[PDB]
């Protein structure tokens, strides 16, 4: 029957992709609420097109402007403001699924609320599992909330897993279902074939070069150091309940293959596709069925060659940090992520060298570790971590 959605983070690209899939399947999906930050012009335009029952701006001043705009453009849309209103729409009774696409720490409480309300969670916020995986998984289990991952790699893994696993994320017994290991793939970044010696000198211009499809600058830098892959690793561990034996990382420079799973009998399954987030989003909407997504089928005439490389730690120390942190737990993953935000900004600011990103991470990470859990405890931790990082940036400058 008809599926009711709330979309947290409707004015970004994840939101646009989600709405594209919805547009392609009018009978199947129905938008009950849309939520965003402070982009009123974009929101009003989306509310005119979609006429949702609710629209929310996190920013209360922005909510007032939208409210006035919509009084005629969308007279049946109730407009609300602030963090509490985000939780409100994420927990409505009639809502079946929630696209959790508000990014950063801002996204935690609203995402958690949907979780506690036992909703399907189309998880597109990194922080929930990077900062607070244990907490999220525990809550999911209490409420019966389904978790459907939107990140391209996690979604691909999910599709390469058998069904019994797919339905027991967070708690899955991989070995008992024949899964030897999960192979998390990534491109290796712009320095994938660059001599390690040369990394000291790298400019943000150089680190930023990417596929025609863009990324934000921070993310582009995390892709250069493979910190991005490390963060995906941490999330993967929680989504798929992966021991130190069960999760690996392979470099695949073309990114046609989006990740893979190695089974006990030697069989490997891999997911591939055109680089459009509507594919993975579509499955998070449709699971266990499939729907049109407005993505073209992959053309093997035009794919080019697919290859694989072995990462090494001299080239990608961040990845080692992340993996190490991953098995130390929430305090370490929280700490690493906080520190890395600062070091990347620092590098972009031309204050530090490219290779200084990992040093900062490492130092901060060490100190905190030498010394129950909540979203707030973790946010505080995040602040401490950022301060330590600031200090350290002063030194390496």
Per-residue binding string, Mn ion, 142-161, x by CB under 5 A, is -----------x--------
Task: Measure the CA–CA gap between 54 and 7, rounded to whole angstroms.
Answer: 10
Q: Judge whether 88 and 80 are in contact, CB under 8 Å.
A: yes
Binding of residue 269 to a second copy (CB under 8 A): yes
Contacting residue, 90, 283, 323, 344, with a second copy by CB under 8 A = 283
Residue 267 binds which entry of Mn ion, a second copy, none, CB below 5-8 Å type-dependent = a second copy
Burial letters for 65-92: b for 16+ Cβ neighbours within 10 Å, e otherwise? bbbebbeeebeebebbbeeebbbbbbbb
Token readout for 16 is 């646009």
Residue-wise DSSP of 144-161: T--EEE-SHHHHHHHHHS
Residue 219 binds which entry of a second copy, Mn ion, none, CB below 5-8 Å type-dependent = none
- Closest CB to a second copy among residues 264, 328: 264
Burial letters for 304-327: b for 16+ Cβ neighbours within 10 Å, e otherwise? eeeeeeebeeebbbbbbbbbebbe
Binding of residue 317 to a second copy (CB under 8 A): no
Q: How far is the CB of 252 from Mn ion (least distance, A)?
A: 11
Which window, 5-13, 137-145, 173-181, 372-380, contacts a second copy (CB under 8 A)?
173-181
- Closest CB to a second copy among residues 49, 290: 290
Q: How many residues bind a second copy (CB under 8 A)?
A: 53
In terms of Cα–Cα distance, which of 9, 7, 2 is closest to 39? 9
Contacting residue, 159, 225, 259, 335, with a second copy by CB under 8 A = 159
Question: Does 229 appear as a known binding residue?
Answer: yes
Q: How far is CA 85 from CA 91, 112, 281, in A?
A: 10, 14, 24
Which window, 118-126, 136-144, 175-183, 350-358, contacts a second copy (CB under 8 A)?
175-183
Tally of CA atoms within 13 A in the half-sphere of 362 that contains its CB? 11
Binding of residue 16 to a second copy (CB under 8 A): no
Task: Measure the CA–CA gap between 113 and 194, rounded to whole angstroms.
Answer: 45
Binding of residue 296 to a second copy (CB under 8 A): yes
Binding of residue 28 to a second copy (CB under 8 A): no
Phi and psi at residue 268, to the nearest 5°: -120, 135
Say which residue the tokens 């390690």 belong to. 196
Which window, 56-64, 129-137, 178-186, 317-325, contacts a second copy (CB under 8 A)?
178-186
Question: Does 17 appear as a known binding residue?
Answer: no
Binding of residue 276 to a second copy (CB under 8 A): yes
In terms of Cα–Cα distance, which of 296, 271, 300, 299 is closest to 24? 296
What is the number of other CB atoms lying within 10 angstroms of the CB of residue 215?
14
Per-residue binding string, a second copy, 227-256, x by CB under 8 A, is -----------------------x------
Question: Does 361 appear as a known binding residue?
Answer: no
Task: Measure the CA–CA gap between 281 and 122, rounded to whole angstroms.
Answer: 8
Contacting residue, 267, 366, 374, 387, with a second copy by CB under 8 A = 267
Task: Measure the CA–CA gap between 107 and 91, rounded to whole angstroms.
Answer: 14
Contacting residue, 306, 328, 369, 397, with a second copy by CB under 8 A = 306
Question: Does 125 appear as a known binding residue?
Answer: yes
| Residues in 274-333 that interact with Mn ion by CB under 5 A | none
Binding of residue 167 to a second copy (CB under 8 A): no
Question: Does 216 appear as a known binding residue?
Answer: yes
- Please provide the size of the chain in residues: 397
Q: Judge whether 94 and 32 are in contact, CB under 8 Å.
A: yes
Question: Does 331 appear as a known binding residue?
Answer: no
Q: Judge whether 224 and 356 are in contact, CB under 8 Å.
A: no
Question: Does 248 appear as a known binding residue?
Answer: no
Say which residue the tokens 């993967």 belong to. 236
Binding of residue 289 to a second copy (CB under 8 A): yes
Contacts of residue 41, defined as CB under 8 A and 6 or more positions apart, other chains included, come to none
**Contact positions toward a second copy, by CB under 8 A?**
21, 159-160, 162-163, 177-181, 183, 250, 260, 262-274, 276, 278-280, 282-283, 286, 288-293, 295-298, 300-301, 303-310
Residues that bind Mn ion (CB under 5 A): 153
Indicate the annotated binding residues for 1-deoxy-D-xylulose 5-phosphate: 126, 152-153, 187, 210, 223, 228-229, 232
Q: Which residues are annotated as a binding site?
A: 11-14, 39, 125-127, 151-153, 187, 210, 216, 223, 228-229, 232
């Amino acid at each position: 029957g008809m599926q009711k959605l709330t979309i947290l983070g409707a004015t970004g690209s994840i939101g646009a992709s989600t709405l594209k899939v919805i547009e392609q399947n009018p009978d199947k999906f129905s938008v009950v609420a849309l939520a965003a930050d402070s982009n009123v012009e974009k929101m009003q335009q989306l509310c005119q097109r979609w006429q949702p029952e609710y629209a929310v701006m996190a920013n209360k001043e922005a909510a007032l402007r939208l409210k006035m705009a919509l009084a005629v453009l969308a007279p049946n849309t109730q407009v609300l403001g602030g963090q509490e209103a985000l939780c409100y729409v994420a927990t409505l009774e009639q809502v079946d699924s929630v696209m959790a696409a508000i990014v950063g720490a801002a996204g935690l409480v609203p995402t958690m609320a949907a979780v506690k309300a036992g909703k399907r969670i189309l998880l597109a916020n990194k922080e929930a599992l990077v900062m607070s995986g244990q907490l999220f998984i525990d809550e999911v289990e209490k409420s019966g909330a389904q978790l459907l991952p939107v990140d391209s790699e996690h979604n691909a893994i999910f599709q390469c897993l058998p069904q019994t696993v797919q339905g027991n994320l967070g708690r899955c017994d991989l070995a008992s279902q024949g899964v030897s290991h999960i192979l998390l793939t990534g491109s290796g970044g712009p320095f994938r074939y660059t001599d390690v010696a040369e990394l000291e000198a790298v400019t943000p211009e150089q680190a930023i070069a990417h596929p025609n499809w863009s990324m934000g600058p921070k993310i582009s830098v995390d892709s250069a150091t493979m910190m991005n892959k490390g963060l995906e690793y941490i999330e993967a561990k929680w989504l798929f309940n992966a021991s130190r034996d069960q999760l690996k990382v392979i470099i695949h420079p073309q990114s046609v293959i989006h990740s893979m799973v190695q089974y006990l009998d030697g069989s490997v399954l891999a997911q591939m596709g055109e680089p459009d987030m509507a594919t993975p989003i579509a499955l998070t909407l449709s699971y266990p069925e499939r729907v049109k997504a407005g993505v073209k089928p992959l053309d093997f005439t035009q794919v080019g060659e697919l290859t694989f490389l072995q990462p090494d730690f001299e080239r990608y120390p961040c990845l080692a940090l992340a993996i190490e942190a991953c098995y130390l737990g929430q305090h370490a993953t929280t700490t690493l992520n906080a520190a890395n935000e600062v070091a990347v900004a620092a590098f972009l600011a031309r204050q530090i060298k490219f290779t200084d990103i990992a040093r900062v991470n490492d130092s901060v990470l060490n100190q905190v570790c030498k010394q129950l859990d909540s979203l707030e405890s973790l946010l505080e931790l995040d602040r401490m971590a950022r301060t330590l990082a600031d200090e350290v940036v002063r030194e390496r400058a």
